[PDB]
């Protein structure tokens, strides 16, 4: 019973690969948006798995709740023609696709380690074998969670980035009105 | 109130949700052993509950008021070995 | 680390080798940001650090504003043209 | 600005090694900065656990081939 | 693309024999028996032409009969639509 | 037209009367939003002086003393 | 530290402490009686507790191995407090922590047992509850006569005992 | 002539209270609720018939 | 995990049958308001009308038209119903008496309510009809526009209690229900609730579309049953949100005196009576709010899309962006910023 | 196996119960015109989209920033005590800066629907 | 009158047999005096109570379960 839930990170990785392939592959882009929603669900799962369910719910309410909604909103209102995934059109990409897959994945796994010899830089990235010990301390007296600390640092130690995000959101209001609306005089 | 025939469905809704809450209170208490539920529990209370499970014989929320622990409490300590996150 | 790099790389390839849509380009950008945020949050958990989660929530906000602006620009393009075709952005 | 803060609002996992290294940097100049090499090695070891992983690889290999 | 399978007799016949246990009509085992029996027309028997009737045949009526199940996915070659579409109003101010 | 805007700079008080009569959804939102910061600036010190002062801080962690160690005994071994 | 994530197997250790480390009894009380005896532990173990924390801080990393004598003293002082409670003040203590259990370990639902226990320990053991950090102008919340926040159901045994103690002048 | 916002026999705050608190709407709610406590007009047809006259066709 | 299954089944049964009888309650209350009576003939006193409707619908064809899509039409009801029902996991009927006692319960509610918009979005895509794709758009605009007001009221309440645990939000209201200091927010939250449920006076696209050949939900059979369950469950859940945010949830008068009179020690009768009282309070509040939904359907006419969007974005959100400033200022003036738990 | 987990999995993998009951119990023998869609109605191969007013898409595009604003206020209400009288001022400045954009939105009348066929308001003047 | 005292009082007037018959037939509880019977076997009643509205004073109790 113990290890029935061991491979639930690997399953999410597998499902993410699948949903990305379906995004690239779907005929109608509405289906691509739905598979993007499924990928957000998978990411939210993984975030619960590693202990960040607050971010899972934030993702569900922001990404799926607003951004995906707006995507569906625009494809319901705009004519977006599509060419179907074809072998007479896309098979030319296979050599470069495979070369780039190998190169980009291997470099993305090599970039995280500080070892000098290049082959060892990948071999340390795949060195996920030994478990972490979780010991318990008694020093945290309060009920501070991740959201509380985000608020604390964002409103005290990092107040400037919040008061700059305010202007970013002002752009988010003022740009679309300038671009979409036509002012009479 | 006059129209009882209109209040009968409201009475059924009321009775069903009331009985559900009551049965759920009873089942929660049976699960806990004669004690109301805990709620709004933080890290501290979780660690203290695990400590209680170490001091009683795994008997849930049973409390102990003695001043010296059994000599099993010295060797009953748990560390958790976590999967590598990837 | 793995899920994020994989999502990022596959989204980048599905952006680069897209001969189909513009919606796929939008989707691949959003999934790229998702992958970065997941690597970021895994490192946040392992180091027990808040700067990663702060950067992540900031990315959420900025990506929302990016989506809003991008889909306003698409709407201007469609104001003038009336059809968003397979090619031509 | 938010450096050294945990998910719970306090000191992070590898605070002490970082603080030792920064004490030694404050003591030193750019020419005496190489004295702070062991402290930086300790900080990075706390972060990434490379040396402990290699150690456990050795232990496991002795449990692996010298028995079977 | 209509899907067809072409799996053997001893298996399909048993599957049909099993699906007669549900209450609604299904493909019967004797129908897959008749799948091997082509039409043998009796020449001594009368025909349509004795009744001064000339039948239709299937390819001329298949359109009429199957067009309800025709999807009609999209229009043909929307290239050459761009510059004419450019003259219409698509978002009303 | 019937009750058009008279302009804030051609009279503030008349403009605000017009706003209360013809744009209450904006006027009273303005009032609600403005009355918080201004009250926070002006009434808080009066509250500290005449009603009750601010509370003393909560601990937030173990209050580690700022002293050197003292030699103790009691509850030693044996 | 963080809580475990995504999979975790508990593992114990059947080894004994080294012999250069003397033995020390453990405290053995669960959550609720310890929450009830927290303030009486703090009234008596202030020097030992702060010496334990000061030797941890001065050690700068080696507190687990440098602070063992000091932690043994802390444990012994706490055990002495709880032994004194059990020897002398057990009925009121049990009222208090059973009352804590039926609530959510909220001390606001247990004031009628808390009063009896505080009186008993102040008279017999000479340990009083004090919430530090306050001013002389601030009222401690455990001495408020009519609070805003009250329990849903006040504990039955505690109510009967409070009534009897007011009829017998023990309070 | 039409009446402007001046020449108003009703203060701004009073009509703003009627605006924000939905006076007439609560009055309509109450007039609907008063019918909730009045006798239903419904006759159970197969067992009680409606009014017929000698002239009926 | 036996008693877990028992608790889940009890909760499911009570919730679903409450929905099925809310349909009858709607009909009978609207009737007696309209000086009529009905339904009273399909059970004794009308108590099997909803089950008759269900059994009829579950024997009807599941006709899907020529230029429609099978999968979307069939699963959109089911996704809507799943999202409507999993929001009941966090609803407490007592101090901790919940299926999901999450410390992030408000965010779970507020995030699972974010997914109810996809039903109205995907309904429009189940046909090759260009005007239903615009009715979809209008409905989704309404829903996303009133989501902001519900979330704003959520945050204004959480300014008073710095927790996302619904039981803690309720237990803070032993002192005062938050409908007393924030009585206008009760009106606003009820209005936005009626608008999120797409209920009259906010029934624009259902009303709009029954006129036209399309732009409404032309489902038959089981999809239709699922949509009715979703609607009449979201009504109870948004009234539940009203409850535990503003009306104290399960709280009532203090019954310590009565319990010390009736009892001498904690028994299971004691616990059962506590639970019955608490869930009785929660249920009578829910009944009042459902009656209010029905009353508002009986009383008022309908809005248009322009009047509705204007209502929202030019009347309600200004007040709330002002209240965001006035509530923390009121807490700063009196040194009453709330602690965690 | 917690009751939360049991419920949230059980609802999806059981929700198709009445779906299957309806698929197995109910008739299904379609017609052409039962697969049809309306009383009257038709459309040639003219287009795939209708012209829409700007407000229809602007409400959705503006839902994103205001929703992000109200969701960014969540850290504050969960940190309100710890950020005592400093974060209060900071979030007030935040809200004021974001109210300026709302003021812009109102004054531009961006969510208003405009009407083409105006009613004529010009006088009738006769050249003598 | 649509009140509960009406049905309780009438079901005290007409016994439980008549109550269950009326609940299975009419759906409502009515108490009146027997006026007569027709050739088919249907019994006809009239009420004098102020509670019953205009056009609800006369009613039928059919003999057949498949009434018409
Ligand atoms: C699908 C995407 C998953 C969304 C995750 C939802 C979530 O964040 O729930 C939190 C989690 C428990 O979190 P917590 O409240 O701290 O512990 C209570 C124990 N009953 O909730 C749970 O108890 C289990 C979550 C399963 C998913
Ligand atoms: C006690 C005194 C309280 C002060 C009252 C202030 C009077 C406000 C006057 C008013 O009603 O504003 C009207 C103005 C224009 O309205 P109108 O002529 O009809 O034209 C709009 C479409 N073109 O409308 C506008 O220009 C738009 C105003 C939008 C207000 C809605 C947002 C409310 C924000 C509340 C926070 C208040 C603090 C804002 C200050 C920001 C400082 C950085
Ligand atoms: C919320 C804060 C309360 C604001 C009070 C208010 O709305 O002022 C209304 C006032 C118009 O009042 P007025 O029409 O001139 O005279 C009525 C006398 N019964 O408006 C004004 O005259 C301007 C006052 C600005 C302050
Ligand atoms: C039982 C439940 C009872 C509640 C049932 C209500 C059902 C739904 C009500 C529908 C709303 C009524 C409506 O039609 O609103 C639109 C209306 C548009 O009119 P407008 O454009 O503003 O023209 C102004 C010139 N007359 O504009 C309006 O009239 C909107 C009126 C405001 C909406 C209510 C706000 C409640 C919050 C009160 C805040 C109080 C604080 C503000 C200051 C108060 C000062 C007195
Ligand atoms: C159900 C058992 C059954 O088998 O049904 C038996 C009956 C028949 O139902 P009925 O003929 O429609 O009602 C009769 C009403 N009349 C003329 C006015 C048609 O149920 C009932 O009356 C209601 C059962 C109790 C309701 C519980 C809530
Ligand atoms: C959810 C349980 C699972 C089984 C599903 C049950 C399905 C039954 C749903 C019925 C709910 C009530 O919904 C229904 O209410 C009344 C019933 O008079 C209808 O109303 C109809 O009746 C008249 C009343 O004479 C109204 O004036 C209105 O003009 C309309 O013609 C509503 O148009 C419909 O929405």
UniProtKB/Swiss-Prot annotation, chain A:
Disulfide bonds: none
Reactions catalysed: a ubiquinone + NADH + 5 H(+)(in) = a ubiquinol + NAD(+) + 4 H(+)(out)
Gene Ontology cellular component terms for the protein in this record: mitochondrial membrane
Highest taxon in the source lineage: Eukaryota
Membrane-related topology note: Multi-pass membrane protein
Family per similarity comment: Belongs to the complex I subunit 6 family.
Protein name listed in UniProt: NADH-ubiquinone oxidoreductase chain 6
Organism lineage string: Eukaryota, Fungi, Dikarya, Ascomycota, Saccharomycotina
